[PDB]
Amino acid sequence: ANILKPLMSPPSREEIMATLL
Amino acid sequence: DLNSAQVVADVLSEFLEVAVHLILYVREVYPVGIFQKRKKYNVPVQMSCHPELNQYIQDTLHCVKPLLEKNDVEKVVVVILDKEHRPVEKFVFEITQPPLLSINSDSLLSHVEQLLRAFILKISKVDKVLDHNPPGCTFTVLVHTREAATRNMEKIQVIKDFPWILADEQDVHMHDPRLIPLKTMTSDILKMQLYVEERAHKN
C-alpha cells in the first residue's frame, strides 16, 4: 500500500561473475 | 528560499548510493572482485566497478529524490533476499525532515556530512555482529511513503524504462527478527536512524 519497489531486478551475482571472468 | 528539502534530497541521494554499495560489499551479495576502494565522506569505502549494477543503483535513488524533496519518504530500506525471494536482512533508514528553511551552503552542509560519516563507519563493521547470509541472495530497495504509495506511485515514475511498483507482503515480512541499531543522527535539515533487521536463523 505505502511501500514501493523497483520493477526491474539488479544484475545477478552470476552476471557479475561472468564479467569478472 | 526554502531550499531545505532540495538540499536534503541531494545529500541523501548521494549518501544512500554510497550506503547501498557498501552494504552489498559487507554482506557479500557480490564478490569482492567487483569492488574498488574509493574515498567518500573522508573515509575508505568500497564501490562496485560494474556499470549495469552502478546504473541500477543510480536509477533507483534518482527516482527517490523527488519524493524526498516533497518529504513523502518515511523509510528507505535496502533488503537482502534469499533464493526463495524472502527477506534475510533489512537495512532500515528511517527519515524525518524538519519544517522547510533557507539554508546557506557553509558549515551546515559539512556538519551533516560529518554526521553521515558515522553511518558509513557502522555499516562497514556490521559483518562483525551479523551471521553470514546463505548463498544465492539478491537485493532490492524499498521506499516507505508517509501516505498511500498509490498517490506517490506516479511521482516516483521519474525514469522511463525503470518503473516502480507496490511491494508485496512477503517482500517485507520477517519472523521476529533480530534488531540491531547502528546509528541515529539529528540536524537542522535531517533526522535519521539506521538499524538492521536480521533473520533469526539463516541456516
How far apart are alpha carbons B117 and B162 in whole angstroms? 30
Report how this structure was experimentally obtained. Answer: X-ray
- Asked whether the beta carbons of residue B34 and residue A12 sit closer than 8 angstroms, the reply is no
**Where is B196: in which H helix or E strand?**
strand B191-198
- Dihedral angle computed from the Cα positions of residues B193, B85, B13 and B114, in that order, rounded to the nearest 10 degrees: 40
CA atoms within 13 A on the CB side of B122: 17
Residues 1-21, chain A, touching B (beta carbon < 8 A): 1-13, 15-17, 19-20
Largest Cα–Cα separation, chain A = 42
Phi, psi of B150 (to 5 degrees): -60, -35
Nearest to B75 by CA among B96, B98, B52: B96
- Asked whether the beta carbons of residue B56 and residue A8 sit closer than 8 angstroms, the reply is yes
**Where is B118: in which H helix or E strand?**
helix B108-123
What's the reported resolution, in angstroms, to a tenth? 1.8
Across the strands, what pairs with B40?
A: B43
- Asked whether the beta carbons of residue A16 and residue B31 sit closer than 8 angstroms, the reply is yes
Contact B81, B167 (CB under 8 A): no
DSSP B203: -
- Name, in order, each residue with C-beta under 8 angstroms of B115's C-beta and a sequence gap of 6 or more: B185, B187
CA distance A6 to chain B (A): 4
Contact B166, B143 (CB under 8 A): no
User: Least CB-CB distance to A16: which of B30, B143, B172?
Assistant: B30
- Dihedral angle computed from the Cα positions of residues B61, B63, B69 and B74, in that order, rounded to the nearest 10 degrees: -70
Provide, as residue numbers in chain B, all residues whose Cβ is less than 8 Å from the Cβ of A13: 29-31, 136, 138
CA B80 to centroid of chain Cα atoms: 12
User: Least CB-CB distance to B50: which of A2, A3, A11?
Assistant: A11
Provide, as residue numbers in chain A, all residues whose Cβ is less than 8 Å from the Cβ of B31: 13, 16-17, 20
CA B158 to centroid of chain Cα atoms: 18
Tell me the residue ranges of DSSP E strands in B65-176: 73-81, 87-96, 138-145, 164-166
CA distance A4 to chain B (A): 5
Cis peptide before B31 (omega within 30 of 0): no
- Name, in order, each residue with C-beta under 8 angstroms of B89's C-beta and a sequence gap of 6 or more: B27, B79, B80, B130, B133, B196, B197, B198, B199
Give the SS3 label for residue B15.
helix
**Residue appearing with cell numbers 539506521:** B194
Give the SS3 label for residue B176.
coil
How far apart are alpha carbons B162 and B130 in whole angstroms? 32
Angle, CA of B189, B71 and B63, to the nearest 5°: 110
